[PDB]
Amino acid sequence: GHMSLEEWIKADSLEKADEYHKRYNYAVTNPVRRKILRMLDKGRSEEEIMQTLSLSKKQLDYHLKVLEAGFCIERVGERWVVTDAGKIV
Amino acid sequence: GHMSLEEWIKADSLEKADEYHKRYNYAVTNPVRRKILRMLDKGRSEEEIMQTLSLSKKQLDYHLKVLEAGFCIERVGERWVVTDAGKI
């Protein structure tokens, strides 16, 4: 009966948490992405980030997408903001 | 960093748990559905269920949709199987 539902909820939570950890870990274990995070947190422009990291618009866009999927940044208007999850040391 | 991620993950888990509870609770709080579950659990056919409960296939299929959405039955090949959650 109702207590057994907790098995379904457990399985789902384990699956989701696995996915979330994978996405976060993928985002943060890349030194270029770590520098993007530090620069965004200092309010650096996308142009300066591209110049300093030698990234094309496409390459930066890719890294931003990964950071967003890994819960490290969120957009407010036209600016990417580093989240609590994205703030490392 | 990681502690903030964990706080979010916990909150997400509780949210999706509440969603699962909503779906299950809806499924089991209908006496026609409760009888459908008891009958499936005893190996009754959909045809027997339709006859015994005076349901059209359309009505039975809708109940089965609701039970599936609420984790009370799962499909195995051609058969709807009652899960431990659906054994009341």
Q: What distinguishing features does this structure have?
A:
homodimer; 89 residues; mainly alpha; Arc Repressor Mutant, subunit A; two-stranded antiparallel sheet; 4 helices; 2 strands; 63% helix; elongated; ArsR-like_HTH (chain A); Arsenical resistance operon repressor, putative (chain A)
**Architecture of chain A, according to CATH?**
Orthogonal Bundle
Number of strands of chain A: 2
The greatest inter-chain interface is formed by: A-B, 21 and 20 residues
> Percent range for helical residues of chain A?
55-70%
Based on Cα principal axes, name the global outline of chain A. Answer: elongated
Describe the strand arrangement of the main beta sheet of chain A, using strand numbers. 1-2
What number of domains of chain A?
Answer: 1
Largest sheet of chain A: 2 strands, antiparallel
Distance between the termini of chain A: 47 Å
CATH superfamily of chain A: Winged helix-like DNA-binding domain superfamily/Winged helix DNA-binding domain
Query: What is the strand content of chain A?
Result: 5-15%
Can you write the helix and strand succession of chain A as a string? HHHHEE
CATH class of chain A: Mainly Alpha
Q: What's the tally of helices of chain A?
A: 4
